[PDB]
């Protein structure tokens, strides 16, 4: 196969939300992260990761669904698929990997009715759900 290629800054713009692992942050300063507000998070479209031996044992275990993480949502909501990527002029080098997120069912965001309440610095509604 003689592939036809395209840049990442051009394919992935600077508007779509992207799930970047905690290692790839300074190499991609133009992509927009997956913001969150009021306890609800956005839905990402791509996932950027480091190379194989780093992603396998440092970032896939740190951001795990069972210890908070961020890969607990995208395994329940989306499906990931690898894409073919090459580092220009330095073939044979492992730069990382890019992935594509496909929805399982077609759904649109909610509306989240709001309100306010004044606590007293010692109030606690109860513990969080951590482990079984």
């Amino acid at each position: 196969r003689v592939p036809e290629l395209q840049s990442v800054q051009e394919y992935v713009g600077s508007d779509q939300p992207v799930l970047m692992d905690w290692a790839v942050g300074l190499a991609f300063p133009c992509q927009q992260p997956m913001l969150h507000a009021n306890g609800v998070t956005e839905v990402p479209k791509f996932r950027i990761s480091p190379d194989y031996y780093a992603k396998l044992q440092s970032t896939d275990t740190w951001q795990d669904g069972i210890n908070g993480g961020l890969l607990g949502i995208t395994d329940l909501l989306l499906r990931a698929s690898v894409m073919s990527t090459y580092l220009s002029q330095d073939w044979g080098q492992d730069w990382g990997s890019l992935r594509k997120f496909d929805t399982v069912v077609e759904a649109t965001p909610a509306e989240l009715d709001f309100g306010s309440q004044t606590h007293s610095g010692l109030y606690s509604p109860g513990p969080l759900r951590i482990r079984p």
Partner: peptide, 24 residues
């Protein structure tokens, strides 16, 4: 990248969260 992503979202979030772990 860990600190950059923590800092680029702390104004929309509103409370300087830990982005990648520990249930926010």
């Amino acid at each position: 990248g860990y600190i950059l992503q923590m800092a680029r979202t702390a104004e929309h979030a509103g409370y300087m969260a830990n982005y990648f772990r520990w249930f926010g």
